[PDB]
Design an enzyme around this catalytic site. Structure first.
Site, short mmCIF file in Angstrom:
data_model
loop_
_atom_site.label_atom_id
_atom_site.label_comp_id
_atom_site.label_asym_id
_atom_site.label_seq_id
_atom_site.Cartn_x
_atom_site.Cartn_y
_atom_site.Cartn_z
N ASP A 15 0.83 -1.24 0.00
CA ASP A 15 0.00 0.00 0.00
C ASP A 15 0.84 1.26 0.00
O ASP A 15 0.31 2.39 0.25
CB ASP A 15 -1.03 -0.06 1.16
CG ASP A 15 -0.38 -0.15 2.52
OD1 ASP A 15 0.82 0.19 2.63
OD2 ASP A 15 -1.10 -0.50 3.46
N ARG A 29 0.97 6.80 0.10
CA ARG A 29 0.27 5.81 0.88
C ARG A 29 -1.14 5.75 0.32
O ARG A 29 -1.82 6.77 0.23
CB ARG A 29 0.27 6.17 2.35
CG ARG A 29 -0.60 5.28 3.24
CD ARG A 29 -0.14 3.81 3.27
NE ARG A 29 -0.72 3.05 4.38
CZ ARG A 29 -1.94 2.48 4.34
NH1 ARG A 29 -2.72 2.57 3.23
NH2 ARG A 29 -2.40 1.80 5.37
N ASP A 34 -5.69 -1.09 3.92
CA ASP A 34 -4.58 -1.56 4.69
C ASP A 34 -4.16 -2.92 4.12
O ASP A 34 -4.93 -3.82 4.11
CB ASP A 34 -4.94 -1.63 6.17
CG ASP A 34 -3.70 -1.87 7.06
OD1 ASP A 34 -2.63 -1.34 6.77
OD2 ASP A 34 -3.87 -2.46 8.08
N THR A 35 -2.96 -2.99 3.61
CA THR A 35 -2.33 -4.25 3.31
C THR A 35 -1.52 -4.80 4.47
O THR A 35 -1.01 -4.06 5.34
CB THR A 35 -1.42 -4.15 2.07
OG1 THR A 35 -0.48 -3.08 2.20
CG2 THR A 35 -2.21 -3.96 0.80
N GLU A 37 1.66 -5.98 6.46
CA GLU A 37 3.07 -5.67 6.37
C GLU A 37 3.74 -6.87 5.69
O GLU A 37 3.22 -7.99 5.76
CB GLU A 37 3.70 -5.45 7.75
CG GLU A 37 3.14 -4.24 8.48
CD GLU A 37 3.28 -2.96 7.67
OE1 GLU A 37 4.38 -2.84 7.13
OE2 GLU A 37 2.32 -2.11 7.59
N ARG A 75 4.13 11.14 3.86
CA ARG A 75 3.67 10.38 2.73
C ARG A 75 2.49 11.10 2.10
O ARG A 75 1.65 11.69 2.82
CB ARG A 75 3.25 8.98 3.14
CG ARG A 75 4.35 8.19 3.81
CD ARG A 75 3.91 6.84 4.18
NE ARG A 75 2.79 6.86 5.11
CZ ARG A 75 2.29 5.77 5.65
NH1 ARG A 75 2.87 4.58 5.45
NH2 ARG A 75 1.26 5.87 6.45
C1 LIG Z 1 -4.02 5.62 5.16
C2 LIG Z 1 -3.66 6.63 6.15
C3 LIG Z 1 -2.76 6.33 7.17
N1 LIG Z 1 -2.45 7.28 8.02
C4 LIG Z 1 -1.55 7.05 9.15
C5 LIG Z 1 -2.37 6.45 10.31
C6 LIG Z 1 -1.41 5.44 10.92
O1 LIG Z 1 -0.75 6.10 12.03
P1 LIG Z 1 0.19 5.23 12.99
O2 LIG Z 1 1.53 4.96 12.24
O3 LIG Z 1 0.45 6.15 14.09
O4 LIG Z 1 -0.44 3.89 13.31
C7 LIG Z 1 -0.47 5.09 9.79
C8 LIG Z 1 -0.77 3.71 9.19
O5 LIG Z 1 -0.06 3.55 7.97
P2 LIG Z 1 0.56 2.16 7.63
O6 LIG Z 1 -0.59 1.24 7.51
O7 LIG Z 1 1.28 2.51 6.37
O8 LIG Z 1 1.44 1.86 8.80
O9 LIG Z 1 -0.62 6.03 8.79
C9 LIG Z 1 -3.08 8.56 7.94
O10 LIG Z 1 -2.77 9.40 8.84
N2 LIG Z 1 -3.96 8.86 7.02
C10 LIG Z 1 -4.31 7.95 6.11
O11 LIG Z 1 -5.17 8.20 5.23
CA LIG Z 2 0.00 -1.56 5.90
#
Ligand SMILES: Cc1cn([C@H]2C[C@H](OP(=O)(O)O)[C@@H](COP(=O)(O)O)O2)c(=O)[nH]c1=O
Ligand SMILES: [Ca+2]
Length: 129
Positions: A15, A29, A34-35, A37, A75
């Site tokens: 993702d 991103r 959510d994919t 890890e 991102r």
């Molecule tokens: C998809 C997305 C993720 N995020 C943030 C929330 C999550 O915070 P935390 O890292 O604090 O958990 C993180 C999850 O991304 P990943 O799934 O890439 O880790 O990215 C956003 O803020 N907005 C979004 O639209």
């Molecule tokens: Ca992910």
């Protein structure tokens, strides 16, 4: 919403994709999914699926939603399209991502993705198996 050009720099994981947008490199991103890890069950498959989809595409586009365009990590937050097919939809429809991180005001394609998730779930595909 509108599609804008971008070019692949590097597929990262299920993702996240590094792309050149407006001439600058940035990690995108995917909105609304959510994919797993890479180290989790179906992670390598998710990475592989996104990789092939973006690498094979003649044309990559990004589509920001109505809200936030960057996350707290810098991102870019967008829907990504590969030759007009949304990456999110393809992943979700295959059971390789879940609809997730649905925040108010950046949720335009939520119901499209939910529909796809329902069909993946019905077929008990991948994450749903
Ligand atoms: C998809 C997305 C993720 N995020 C943030 C929330 C999550 O915070 P935390 O890292 O604090 O958990 C993180 C999850 O991304 P990943 O799934 O890439 O880790 O990215 C956003 O803020 N907005 C979004 O639209
Ligand atoms: Ca992910």
């Amino acid at each position: 919403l509108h599609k804008e050009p971008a070019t692949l720099i590097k597929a990262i994981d299920g993702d996240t994709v590094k792309e050149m947008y407006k001439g600058q490199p940035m990690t995108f991103r995917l909105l609304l999914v959510d994919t797993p890890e890479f180290n989790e069950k179906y992670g390598p498959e998710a990475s592989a699926f996104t990789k092939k989809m973006v690498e094979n595409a003649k044309k990559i586009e990004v589509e920001f939603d109505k809200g936030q365009r960057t996350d707290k990590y810098g991102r870019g937050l967008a829907y990504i399209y590969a030759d007009g097919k949304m990456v999110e939809e393809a992943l979700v429809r295959q059971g390789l991502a879940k609809v997730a991180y649905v925040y108010k005001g950046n949720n335009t394609h939520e119901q499209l993705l939910r529909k796809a998730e329902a069909q993946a779930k019905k077929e008990k595909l991948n994450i749903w198996s």
